[PDB]
Amino acid sequence: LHKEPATLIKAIDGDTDKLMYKGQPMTFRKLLVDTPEFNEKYGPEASAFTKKMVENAKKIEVEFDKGQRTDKYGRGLAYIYADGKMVNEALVRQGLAKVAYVYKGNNTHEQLLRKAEAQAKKEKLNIWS
Ligand SMILES: Cc1cn([C@H]2C[C@H](OP(=O)(O)O)[C@@H](COP(=O)(O)O)O2)c(=O)[nH]c1=O
Ligand SMILES: [Ca+2]
């Protein structure tokens, strides 16, 4: 997989961000994760976590997997990176997202995230408390 540049247009919630990619605006949905919606427990905290990460980053990057790049809703499917740190992984490690939506052909980082989830659960963090 390769990292590609993107610029933050607007943080939306734990799972999504409006980004400029190849000079066009696009909602990006994080691969391999499911965060609670704002109205659910830890939803607000998830949104806040990701917002801070992407807003404070000097460099935002997107990494497509080997499979589908856009979902049924026109959203880009990618690993999102803030100053080299994957937001997808960080959410799971902090117990603010579960590993989810793992489809064949789009699961390069499955094990990495699952490892993070186990550590979050072991630490009884957030979703796991
Ligand atoms: C993460 C992800 C979600 N999606 C779709 C499946 C789910 O369909 P449904 O909308 O029919 O439930 C939905 C979940 O996204 P959200 O979790 O943002 O709602 O997005 C994919 O198709 N591929 C993916 O990799
Ligand atoms: Ca969600």
Tell me the pairing of strands 76-82 and 24-30.
parallel
Matching CATH number, 4-128, of 1.10.150.120, 3.30.2350.10, 2.40.290.10, 2.40.50.90: 2.40.50.90
Give the DSSP letter of residue 13. S
DSSP 79: E
Does residue 34 have a known ligand-binding role? yes
Known catalytic membership, residue 123 = no
* Ligand 1 center from residue 74 Cα (angstroms): 11
Inter-residue contact 125 to 95 (CB < 8 Å): yes
Domain boundaries, the chain: 4-128
Contact 95, 127 (CB under 8 A): yes
Q: H or E segment at 52?
A: helix 43-56
How close is the Cα of 101 to the center of ligand 1, in Å?
7
Ligand 1 atom with least separation from CA of 72: 22
Q: Within a 10 A sphere around the Cβ of 109, how many other Cβ atoms?
A: 20
Of 63, 75, 110, 114, which one is the catalytic site residue? 75
Name the residue with tokens 């961000």.
17
Q: Is 35 annotated as a binding residue?
A: yes
PDB resolution in Å: 1.9
